[PDB]
């Protein structure tokens, strides 16, 4: 319930005008690894409450956002700070590896 489902249009407000950190998961229904990381993202959203918003963007229903960031495939994670990309990860990760990524990305 802490996870935000973005559209191409709502991205322009909820991400670009937001101070704070937002982890955006670019995914699609056909993508197996994307679906598998979904429970990890739920856990992160709870654990990082007050620190990080977790958001998802379904690239087939929202084809405009990924090209703006040069995203070539899914799953891809973009960590925004204050409306700008602050870190990226292409590919799926274990929970422990995702937390390592976040330690570095939030620093
Ligand atoms: Cu919930
Ligand atoms: Cu939930």
Automatic annotation (TrEMBL):
Q: Which UniProt keywords apply?
A: Disulfide bond, Electron transport, Redox-active center, Transport
Q: Which residues of the full protein are shown?
A: 21 to 127 of 127
The protein's site described by Deprotonates C-terminal active site Cys is found at 25
One GO biological process this protein is involved in is: cell redox homeostasis
Q: Which cysteines are joined by disulfide bonds?
A: 31-34
Q: What is this protein called?
A: Thioredoxin
- Role description: Participates in various redox reactions through the reversible oxidation of its active center dithiol to a disulfide and catalyzes dithiol-disulfide exchange reactions.
According to its UniProt record, which protein family does this protein belong to? Belongs to the thioredoxin family.
List the transmembrane segments: none
């Amino acid at each position: 319930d802490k996870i935000i489902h973005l559209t191409d249009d709502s991205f322009d407000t909820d991400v670009l005008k937001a101070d704070g950190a937002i982890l955006v998961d670019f995914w699609a229904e056909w993508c197996g690894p994307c679906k598998m990381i979904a429970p990890i993202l739920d856990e992160i959203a709870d654990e990082y409450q007050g620190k990080l918003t977790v958001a998802k963007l379904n690239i087939d229903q929202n084809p405009g956002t990924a090209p703006k960031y040069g995203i070539r495939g899914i799953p891809t994670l973009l960590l925004f700070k204050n409306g700008e990309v602050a870190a990226t990860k292409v590919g799926a990760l274990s929970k422990g590896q995702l937390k390592e990524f976040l330690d570095a990305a939030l620093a």
